[PDB]
Short mmCIF file of C-alpha atoms in Angstrom, two decimals:
data_model
loop_
_atom_site.label_atom_id
_atom_site.label_comp_id
_atom_site.label_asym_id
_atom_site.label_seq_id
_atom_site.Cartn_x
_atom_site.Cartn_y
_atom_site.Cartn_z
CA UNK A 1 101.70 82.18 95.46
CA UNK A 2 97.92 81.99 95.80
CA UNK A 3 97.29 80.59 92.40
CA UNK A 4 99.98 77.94 93.01
CA UNK A 5 98.28 76.88 96.30
CA UNK A 6 95.00 76.79 94.52
CA UNK A 7 96.44 74.62 91.75
CA UNK A 8 98.21 72.34 94.36
CA UNK A 9 95.06 71.84 96.51
CA UNK A 10 93.00 70.75 93.56
CA UNK A 11 95.79 68.58 92.14
CA UNK A 12 96.34 66.75 95.45
CA UNK A 13 92.63 66.17 95.97
CA UNK A 14 92.33 64.68 92.44
CA UNK A 15 95.55 62.71 91.91
CA UNK A 16 97.34 62.14 95.26
CA UNK A 17 96.97 59.42 97.89
CA UNK A 18 98.77 58.34 101.06
CA UNK A 19 100.74 55.14 100.63
CA UNK A 20 102.42 52.81 103.19
CA UNK A 21 105.28 50.54 102.14
CA UNK A 22 107.50 48.52 104.49
CA UNK A 23 109.83 51.54 104.44
CA UNK A 24 107.40 54.18 105.61
CA UNK A 25 104.48 56.33 104.68
CA UNK A 26 104.68 58.44 101.50
CA UNK A 27 102.69 60.86 99.47
CA UNK A 28 101.93 59.25 96.07
CA UNK A 29 100.90 60.96 92.77
CA UNK A 30 98.99 59.07 90.14
CA UNK A 31 100.03 60.10 86.72
CA UNK A 32 97.72 58.29 84.19
CA UNK A 33 95.92 55.05 83.93
CA UNK A 34 97.30 52.80 86.82
CA UNK A 35 100.76 54.25 86.77
CA UNK A 36 102.11 56.36 89.69
CA UNK A 37 105.35 57.64 91.04
CA UNK A 38 107.09 57.35 94.45
CA UNK A 39 110.39 58.55 95.61
CA UNK A 40 112.97 55.78 95.22
CA UNK A 41 113.51 55.40 98.89
CA UNK A 42 109.87 54.15 99.34
CA UNK A 43 111.19 50.79 97.98
CA UNK A 44 107.65 49.42 97.39
CA UNK A 45 107.15 45.67 97.68
CA UNK A 46 104.72 43.45 95.69
CA UNK A 47 101.89 45.02 97.61
CA UNK A 48 101.31 48.59 99.02
CA UNK A 49 98.72 50.27 101.24
CA UNK A 50 96.97 53.06 99.44
CA UNK A 51 94.49 55.05 101.55
CA UNK A 52 94.54 52.16 104.04
CA UNK A 53 93.54 49.60 101.40
CA UNK A 54 95.82 46.87 100.05
CA UNK A 55 96.91 47.12 96.46
CA UNK A 56 98.98 44.92 94.25
CA UNK A 57 102.00 46.37 92.44
CA UNK A 58 102.41 44.88 88.91
CA UNK A 59 105.62 46.67 88.05
CA UNK A 60 108.34 48.85 89.64
CA UNK A 61 110.89 50.85 87.64
CA UNK A 62 113.83 52.47 89.45
CA UNK A 63 114.53 55.31 86.95
CA UNK A 64 118.16 56.01 85.79
CA UNK A 65 119.57 58.28 82.98
CA UNK A 66 121.32 57.08 79.81
CA UNK A 67 124.64 56.82 81.49
CA UNK A 68 123.00 54.86 84.34
CA UNK A 69 122.92 57.66 86.90
CA UNK A 70 120.33 57.60 89.63
CA UNK A 71 117.16 59.70 89.10
CA UNK A 72 115.68 58.82 92.62
CA UNK A 73 112.15 57.96 91.39
CA UNK A 74 110.33 54.70 91.23
CA UNK A 75 107.43 54.31 88.87
CA UNK A 76 104.85 51.77 89.76
CA UNK A 77 101.83 50.16 88.08
CA UNK A 78 99.03 49.30 90.39
CA UNK A 79 96.64 46.35 90.27
CA UNK A 80 93.33 48.19 90.55
CA UNK A 81 90.31 49.09 88.44
CA UNK A 82 89.89 52.79 88.98
CA UNK A 83 92.04 54.90 86.55
CA UNK A 84 94.07 57.99 87.50
CA UNK A 85 93.02 61.33 85.97
CA UNK A 86 95.61 61.79 83.15
CA UNK A 87 97.97 64.60 84.36
CA UNK A 88 100.73 64.05 81.82
CA UNK A 89 100.08 67.41 80.17
CA UNK A 90 101.13 69.08 83.47
CA UNK A 91 104.58 67.42 83.26
CA UNK A 92 107.39 69.47 81.62
CA UNK A 93 109.68 68.05 78.94
CA UNK A 94 112.63 69.23 80.89
CA UNK A 95 113.53 70.73 84.25
CA UNK A 96 111.23 73.58 85.25
CA UNK A 97 112.62 76.62 87.12
CA UNK A 98 110.11 78.87 88.79
CA UNK A 99 110.21 81.78 91.25
CA UNK A 100 107.15 80.64 93.36
CA UNK A 101 106.63 76.93 94.09
CA UNK A 102 104.45 75.03 96.66
CA UNK A 103 105.37 71.58 98.08
CA UNK A 104 102.30 69.45 98.97
CA UNK A 105 102.46 66.57 101.47
CA UNK A 106 99.55 64.08 102.11
CA UNK A 107 100.44 61.48 104.80
CA UNK A 108 99.38 60.69 108.48
CA UNK A 109 102.35 62.68 109.89
CA UNK A 110 101.64 65.59 107.46
CA UNK A 111 97.95 65.48 106.45
CA UNK A 112 96.96 68.00 103.62
CA UNK A 113 99.85 70.34 104.24
CA UNK A 114 101.32 72.89 101.90
CA UNK A 115 104.63 74.69 102.04
CA UNK A 116 105.78 77.86 100.14
CA UNK A 117 109.26 77.04 99.02
CA UNK A 118 109.58 80.14 96.62
CA UNK A 119 112.23 79.84 93.92
CA UNK A 120 113.06 76.45 92.39
CA UNK A 121 116.29 76.25 90.44
CA UNK A 122 117.63 73.26 88.46
CA UNK A 123 120.42 72.28 90.67
CA UNK A 124 121.14 69.26 88.53
CA UNK A 125 123.86 66.97 89.89
CA UNK A 126 123.86 65.95 93.58
CA UNK A 127 125.56 63.35 95.72
CA UNK A 128 122.38 62.18 97.55
CA UNK A 129 123.81 60.33 100.58
CA UNK A 130 126.48 58.41 98.70
CA UNK A 131 124.60 58.11 95.39
CA UNK A 132 125.36 60.29 92.35
CA UNK A 133 121.94 61.77 91.47
CA UNK A 134 120.90 63.91 88.49
CA UNK A 135 117.96 66.08 87.45
CA UNK A 136 117.55 67.54 90.82
CA UNK A 137 115.58 70.63 91.62
CA UNK A 138 116.52 72.69 94.69
CA UNK A 139 114.57 75.02 96.88
CA UNK A 140 115.25 76.41 100.27
CA UNK A 141 113.07 74.97 103.06
CA UNK A 142 113.94 73.52 106.59
CA UNK A 143 113.60 69.83 105.80
CA UNK A 144 112.19 67.02 108.00
CA UNK A 145 111.81 63.28 107.10
CA UNK A 146 108.29 62.17 105.95
CA UNK A 147 108.19 64.93 103.39
CA UNK A 148 109.50 62.33 100.91
CA UNK A 149 107.03 61.92 98.15
CA UNK A 150 105.84 65.49 98.57
CA UNK A 151 104.72 66.98 95.22
CA UNK A 152 106.48 70.14 94.01
CA UNK A 153 104.01 72.45 92.05
CA UNK A 154 103.48 75.89 90.59
CA UNK A 155 100.47 77.38 88.73
CA UNK A 156 99.53 74.81 86.11
CA UNK A 157 102.77 72.78 86.46
CA UNK A 158 103.71 69.63 88.36
CA UNK A 159 107.48 70.04 88.68
CA UNK A 160 108.79 67.11 90.68
CA UNK A 161 108.76 64.84 93.68
CA UNK A 162 110.50 65.71 96.91
CA UNK A 163 113.30 63.19 97.59
CA UNK A 164 115.78 64.71 100.09
CA UNK A 165 116.92 67.61 102.15
CA UNK A 166 119.61 69.17 104.40
CA UNK A 167 118.11 71.44 107.07
CA UNK A 168 117.64 74.45 104.72
CA UNK A 169 117.62 72.93 101.26
CA UNK A 170 115.17 70.54 99.67
CA UNK A 171 115.63 68.41 96.56
CA UNK A 172 113.01 67.09 94.15
CA UNK A 173 113.50 64.72 91.32
CA UNK A 174 112.23 66.38 88.18
CA UNK A 175 109.01 64.76 86.94
CA UNK A 176 109.49 64.66 83.16
CA UNK A 177 106.75 63.95 80.63
CA UNK A 178 108.78 61.32 78.76
CA UNK A 179 109.15 59.09 81.82
CA UNK A 180 105.61 58.31 81.01
CA UNK A 181 105.46 55.60 78.33
CA UNK B 1 91.70 79.89 98.96
CA UNK B 2 94.66 81.53 97.16
CA UNK B 3 94.21 84.97 98.64
CA UNK B 4 93.84 83.43 102.14
CA UNK B 5 97.22 81.59 101.68
CA UNK B 6 98.80 84.74 100.42
CA UNK B 7 97.44 86.67 103.42
CA UNK B 8 98.61 83.84 105.87
CA UNK B 9 102.15 83.57 104.45
CA UNK B 10 102.72 87.32 104.85
CA UNK B 11 101.10 87.38 108.25
CA UNK B 12 103.24 84.48 109.55
CA UNK B 13 106.41 85.95 108.18
CA UNK B 14 105.68 89.31 109.88
CA UNK B 15 104.06 88.40 113.21
CA UNK B 16 104.73 84.75 114.04
CA UNK B 17 107.57 83.00 115.80
CA UNK B 18 108.39 79.52 117.11
CA UNK B 19 108.31 79.27 120.87
CA UNK B 20 109.54 76.53 123.29
CA UNK B 21 108.07 76.28 126.79
CA UNK B 22 108.65 73.43 129.23
CA UNK B 23 105.48 71.96 127.85
CA UNK B 24 106.40 71.81 124.17
CA UNK B 25 107.06 73.83 121.03
CA UNK B 26 104.30 76.14 119.82
CA UNK B 27 103.57 78.66 117.13
CA UNK B 28 103.23 82.09 118.67
CA UNK B 29 101.49 85.24 117.25
CA UNK B 30 102.55 88.64 118.32
CA UNK B 31 99.58 91.02 118.45
CA UNK B 32 100.93 94.50 119.29
CA UNK B 33 103.73 96.04 121.24
CA UNK B 34 105.28 93.20 123.39
CA UNK B 35 101.98 91.29 123.84
CA UNK B 36 101.42 87.90 122.17
CA UNK B 37 99.16 84.91 122.50
CA UNK B 38 99.67 81.18 123.03
CA UNK B 39 97.28 78.40 123.44
CA UNK B 40 96.63 77.83 127.16
CA UNK B 41 98.21 74.41 127.12
CA UNK B 42 101.66 76.00 126.40
CA UNK B 43 101.70 76.93 130.12
CA UNK B 44 104.61 79.36 129.68
CA UNK B 45 107.04 79.83 132.57
CA UNK B 46 108.88 82.97 133.65
CA UNK B 47 111.04 82.58 130.55
CA UNK B 48 110.40 81.19 127.04
CA UNK B 49 112.51 80.37 124.00
CA UNK B 50 111.50 82.46 121.01
CA UNK B 51 113.31 81.62 117.75
CA UNK B 52 115.91 79.83 119.92
CA UNK B 53 116.67 82.90 122.01
CA UNK B 54 115.75 83.24 125.68
CA UNK B 55 113.04 85.73 126.57
CA UNK B 56 111.55 86.88 129.84
CA UNK B 57 107.83 86.82 130.31
CA UNK B 58 106.54 89.79 132.34
CA UNK B 59 102.99 88.67 132.50
CA UNK B 60 100.66 85.75 131.71
CA UNK B 61 96.84 85.98 131.52
CA UNK B 62 94.88 82.75 131.32
CA UNK B 63 91.67 84.17 129.61
CA UNK B 64 88.15 83.31 130.93
CA UNK B 65 84.64 84.73 130.13
CA UNK B 66 82.47 86.77 132.47
CA UNK B 67 80.98 83.64 134.06
CA UNK B 68 84.53 82.27 134.55
CA UNK B 69 84.45 79.79 131.70
CA UNK B 70 87.71 78.74 130.06
CA UNK B 71 88.65 80.45 126.77
CA UNK B 72 91.86 78.33 126.23
CA UNK B 73 94.20 81.23 125.44
CA UNK B 74 97.10 82.67 127.39
CA UNK B 75 98.22 86.19 126.67
CA UNK B 76 101.78 86.99 127.48
CA UNK B 77 103.92 90.15 127.70
CA UNK B 78 107.51 89.64 126.69
CA UNK B 79 110.63 91.31 128.07
CA UNK B 80 112.25 92.50 124.82
CA UNK B 81 112.92 95.69 122.93
CA UNK B 82 111.65 94.96 119.45
CA UNK B 83 107.91 95.74 119.10
CA UNK B 84 105.30 93.53 117.27
CA UNK B 85 103.69 94.94 114.12
CA UNK B 86 100.29 96.00 115.37
CA UNK B 87 97.72 93.47 113.95
CA UNK B 88 94.79 94.37 116.20
CA UNK B 89 92.78 95.71 113.24
CA UNK B 90 92.81 92.17 111.81
CA UNK B 91 91.02 90.78 114.91
CA UNK B 92 87.20 90.55 114.80
CA UNK B 93 84.92 91.92 117.55
CA UNK B 94 83.20 88.63 117.68
CA UNK B 95 83.50 85.08 116.27
CA UNK B 96 84.14 85.01 112.57
CA UNK B 97 82.55 82.40 110.38
CA UNK B 98 84.07 81.91 106.91
CA UNK B 99 83.78 79.35 104.07
CA UNK B 100 87.55 79.21 103.24
CA UNK B 101 90.17 79.28 106.05
CA UNK B 102 93.84 78.39 106.18
CA UNK B 103 95.60 77.10 109.37
CA UNK B 104 99.28 78.17 109.61
CA UNK B 105 101.84 76.28 111.78
CA UNK B 106 105.47 77.49 112.34
CA UNK B 107 107.44 75.09 114.58
CA UNK B 108 110.37 72.50 114.16
CA UNK B 109 107.94 69.62 113.69
CA UNK B 110 105.82 71.73 111.27
CA UNK B 111 108.05 74.40 109.72
CA UNK B 112 106.15 77.01 107.55
CA UNK B 113 103.18 74.73 106.85
CA UNK B 114 99.66 75.75 105.71
CA UNK B 115 96.55 73.72 105.79
CA UNK B 116 93.24 74.41 103.94
CA UNK B 117 90.51 73.73 106.48
CA UNK B 118 87.70 75.23 104.31
CA UNK B 119 84.55 76.31 106.27
CA UNK B 120 84.88 77.62 109.86
CA UNK B 121 81.72 77.72 111.97
CA UNK B 122 81.31 79.15 115.42
CA UNK B 123 80.81 75.90 117.31
CA UNK B 124 80.72 77.84 120.57
CA UNK B 125 80.66 75.59 123.64
CA UNK B 126 82.93 72.54 123.97
CA UNK B 127 84.08 70.19 126.67
CA UNK B 128 87.83 70.33 125.82
CA UNK B 129 89.12 67.26 127.67
CA UNK B 130 87.28 67.76 130.94
CA UNK B 131 87.18 71.57 130.72
CA UNK B 132 84.02 73.57 129.73
CA UNK B 133 85.35 75.81 126.94
CA UNK B 134 83.59 78.62 125.07
CA UNK B 135 84.12 80.76 121.94
CA UNK B 136 85.29 77.85 119.93
CA UNK B 137 85.58 77.75 116.23
CA UNK B 138 85.41 74.40 114.41
CA UNK B 139 86.70 73.22 111.07
CA UNK B 140 87.19 69.79 109.71
CA UNK B 141 90.83 68.61 109.51
CA UNK B 142 92.58 65.38 110.55
CA UNK B 143 94.32 66.66 113.72
CA UNK B 144 97.77 65.79 115.06
CA UNK B 145 99.48 67.23 118.21
CA UNK B 146 102.01 70.18 117.71
CA UNK B 147 99.46 72.02 115.64
CA UNK B 148 98.60 73.80 118.94
CA UNK B 149 99.22 77.44 118.47
CA UNK B 150 98.52 77.26 114.75
CA UNK B 151 96.98 80.50 113.48
CA UNK B 152 93.60 80.32 111.79
CA UNK B 153 93.24 82.92 109.00
CA UNK B 154 91.20 84.01 105.94
CA UNK B 155 91.74 86.91 103.50
CA UNK B 156 92.38 89.96 105.67
CA UNK B 157 91.18 88.27 108.95
CA UNK B 158 93.03 86.57 111.81
CA UNK B 159 90.29 84.42 113.23
CA UNK B 160 91.79 82.35 116.08
CA UNK B 161 94.41 80.11 117.54
CA UNK B 162 94.30 76.37 117.14
CA UNK B 163 93.88 74.70 120.56
CA UNK B 164 92.49 71.14 120.06
CA UNK B 165 91.23 68.41 117.79
CA UNK B 166 89.68 64.94 117.38
CA UNK B 167 90.84 63.13 114.29
CA UNK B 168 88.56 64.97 111.86
CA UNK B 169 87.69 68.19 113.70
CA UNK B 170 89.86 71.03 114.84
CA UNK B 171 89.11 73.75 117.33
CA UNK B 172 90.43 77.33 117.59
CA UNK B 173 89.87 79.84 120.32
CA UNK B 174 88.46 82.97 118.74
CA UNK B 175 91.01 85.75 118.84
CA UNK B 176 88.81 88.79 119.72
CA UNK B 177 89.94 92.43 119.39
CA UNK B 178 88.84 93.30 122.96
CA UNK B 179 91.18 90.74 124.56
CA UNK B 180 93.72 93.36 123.61
CA UNK B 181 93.87 96.06 126.33
#
């Protein structure tokens, strides 16, 4: 658990920011270059607020699988000079299962908070409030709203982005390496 | 940092509970026997809610120093059979300063959350919203309300209880071993 928290703290400090869209405040992870990811429900507009400063959004991809199914992630390309530390080598080729994960949240409502969720299992398919969603990861933790965007991590691995919950279970979209080109 | 989080997680799981008084929801730490501590502002009544079950409060001591100054902690003795794991040997004789601390919160608004606050320094005297307060510990973290009661920890040490903040600084009351007799 300790090494996962140590990994998470350094990761969040280096690659995470707090983002405000018209739909709420979210944790955001920069992946490489000027590309980041948000949970789909952040519905970013043509501009976002990133650490309280206004930033233009050049592109927004709502990710779906080959048979069109919802993946619940939105990739965005930001209009800014500074480049994200490349973290693509932390992203698995496929769904990671682990016995000890930490979920990191970085917003106003949850500033630098970390949650031990323990075991993460590829749950896979999920009807996420009406929408057929795939590549879900599940862990047991008493969900609240505003955790959306939280980053799911273990030692050396960024596993996914928190996208939903039901009182004792949380769901992350798996953050796969191939999303990133 | 990792060992502190590992310490905190096990400590919270063993000795902490979520408590509702008429003044709010708070993290509570059981110390030994049927004695626990709350931040003063929890103002517990003759009964509390502890993990959603009603519990009688046999005694409540608002702690002050020898010259009467506010210490911002309330000790309470609970009317229940189950005994707290004795954690008095984790409590320092005097104010602990450390370079890496973790603040643990366990309520509905913040369920099993952990925050790296880094360096804790005996700040000592503080005018805590009108009240002259002593034996304060200070750390830098972007405070929100509902963190009251949070438990401040490092590897092997329970340092204090979170009692106040101002946007970038948090304050804990030092949890001294001698309070406990």
